[PDB]
Amino acid sequence: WGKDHQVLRLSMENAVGTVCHPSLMNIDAAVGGVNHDPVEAANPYGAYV
Amino acid sequence: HGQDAVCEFIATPVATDINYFRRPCNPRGRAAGGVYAGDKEGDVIALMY
């Protein structure tokens, strides 16, 4: 309800201006910040071509 | 019963949802008053159209 006896609606077409920016594909700092303090051999069956 | 009221008509599409009604809403689908504008003095043709 708005600031009355009034209804309002929030869709997921509402979400157009947030999920569609070209920052969803911006993971540069993520791989770098997790990279230090390494992980041991995780017997890479599905993690290797 | 007294004096008569007069009923007049404006065509509408069938899916102009009823939630816009049940409310003090306006006929011409737009906030049409000269009070609501932002004091630009060319504003209320753009506030109406």
Side-chain angles (χ1 to χ4, degrees), chain A residues 1-4 6-12 14-36 38-39 41-49, chain B residues 1-38 40 42-49:
Chain A
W1 282 336
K3 58 180 298 299
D4 271 330
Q6 181 181 359
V7 77
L8 295 177
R9 185 175 67 85
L10 298 180
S11 65
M12 297 185 69
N14 189 6
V16 59
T18 305
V19 74
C20 300
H21 185 275
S23 66
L24 185 61
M25 299 296 172
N26 193 2
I27 45 96
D28 53 353
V31 57
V34 75
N35 199 0
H36 58 86
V39 67
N43 59 16
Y45 179 72
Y48 177 70
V49 178
Chain B
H1 291 282
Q3 199 179 11
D4 297 332
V6 176
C7 303
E8 288 188 348
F9 295 129
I10 296 97
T12 51
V14 286
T16 63
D17 46 357
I18 316 296
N19 293 315
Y20 177 73
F21 297 94
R22 293 187 286 267
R23 196 263 178 85
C25 69
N26 301 327
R28 60 183 299 277
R30 186 173 180 85
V35 180
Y36 295 164
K40 192 182 179 181
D43 45 357
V44 197
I45 297 169
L47 194 272
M48 191 177 175
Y49 294 98

